[PDB]
């Protein structure tokens, strides 16, 4: 089997992408908001504390005639900006662009935080991490991946990002019309629960590749690119006017700047960022200081390659019994 959905970003900056997903019979349509950091499906549910729902799309189980409570299971997620949600679990049937998953654990919401409630756009989150990060107690819980790898063409999954324009996430295959060049595919340590990897190196606009290992992981469910210190240092040292600002919380540069390209190396291949992709806009309304999309990850502690990076390429995530990841230019 096979599956293909297109995927479309919230707003239009790209601060995420959401992808229609059918739950439940009859199906009722989500819009989430693919996490391969996460390894969760949890959705706004008719279970969700009322004042926590302010226009997004809820899933409500008794309505569905596949719909099982997971009795017992419960879930608890954070995403390290302040967020997060919890609440219990049911299965159900869970279909992304044509593929069918039966039994799948639906997490359903029974409290959301603020930054949830205030984005109507994102219905849930469908994590596509390994299942050794699910959340769901006392009985841990697959990814939709997870469970739909075996049905598969192909143990695989891609991700072809839209820079301001939608984009499509497929299951089981790889659209080889969908990139140019050559995938170069890269090693993969499952270790921490991620899509984690060592980069070769980066150039920051026409300068000279250093080459060094930067190790990270391949994160849709991050909007920015988290680098080292160093390495985000000699980026912005590239626009007059940037700097690091403590107060907005990140690197700022004035809106009038064209910001340079940011490559980073997949092995001996290149994936170049423009630099338009890098311009997340004003801080506020009306501002001259624009945010930038390369900000240092020295408060995280991994390196993300995020939504920015991502999406100047054709990725390919290889669920092989040995997983691998693969990067092509597009
Ligand atoms: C506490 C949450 O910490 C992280 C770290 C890295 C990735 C993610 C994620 N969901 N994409 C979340
Ligand atoms: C790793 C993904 O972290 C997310 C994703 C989507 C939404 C939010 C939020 N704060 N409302 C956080």
């Known amino acids: 089997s096979t599956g293909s959905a297109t995927t479309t970003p ?98 359903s919401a029974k409290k959301v935080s603020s930054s949830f409630t205030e984005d109507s756009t994102i219905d849930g989150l469908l994590g596509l991490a390994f299942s050794t990060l699910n959340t769901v107690s006392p009985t841990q819980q697959k990814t939709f991946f997870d469970n739909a790898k075996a049905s598969l063409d192909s143990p695989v999954f891609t991700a072809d990002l839209g820079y301001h324009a939608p984009g499509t ?36 606009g026409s300068g000279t590749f250093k080459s060094t290992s930067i190790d990270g992981i391949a994160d849709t469910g991050t909007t920015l690119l988290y680098l080292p210190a160093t390495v985000v240092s000699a980026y912005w040292a590239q626009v007059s006017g940037a700097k690091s600002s403590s107060s907005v919380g990140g690197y700022v540069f004035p809106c009038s700047a064209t910001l340079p390209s940011f490559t980073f190396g997949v092995g001996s291949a290149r994936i170049v960022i423009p630099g338009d992709y890098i ?17 240092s990850s020295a408060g995280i502690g991994i390196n993300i390659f995020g939504d920015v990076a991502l999406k100047a390429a054709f990725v390919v995530f290889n669920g092989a019994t040995t997983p691998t990841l693969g990067f092509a230019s597009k």
């Open 10 to 107: 919230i707003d239009s900056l790209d601060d995420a992408y959401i992808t229609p997903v059918q739950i439940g019979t009859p199906a009722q349509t989500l819009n989430l908001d693919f996490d391969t950091g996460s390894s969760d499906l949890w959705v706004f549910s008719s279970e969700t504390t009322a004042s926590e729902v302010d226009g997004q799309t809820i899933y409500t189980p008794s309505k569905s005639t596949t719909a099982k409570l997971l009795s017992g299971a419960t879930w608890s997620i954070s995403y390290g900006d302040g967020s997060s949600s919890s609440g219990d679990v049911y299965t159900d049937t869970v279909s992304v662009g044509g593929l069918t998953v039966t039994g799948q654990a639906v997490e």
């Open 169 to 204: 996430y497929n299951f089981g295959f790889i659209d080889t019309t969908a990139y140019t060049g050559s995938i170069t595919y890269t090693a993969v340590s499952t270790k921490q629960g991620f899509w984690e990897w060592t980069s070769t190196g980066y150039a920051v």
């Open 279 to 295: 311009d997340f806009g004003p801080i506020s309304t009306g501002s001259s200081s624009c945010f930038g999309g390369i900000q």
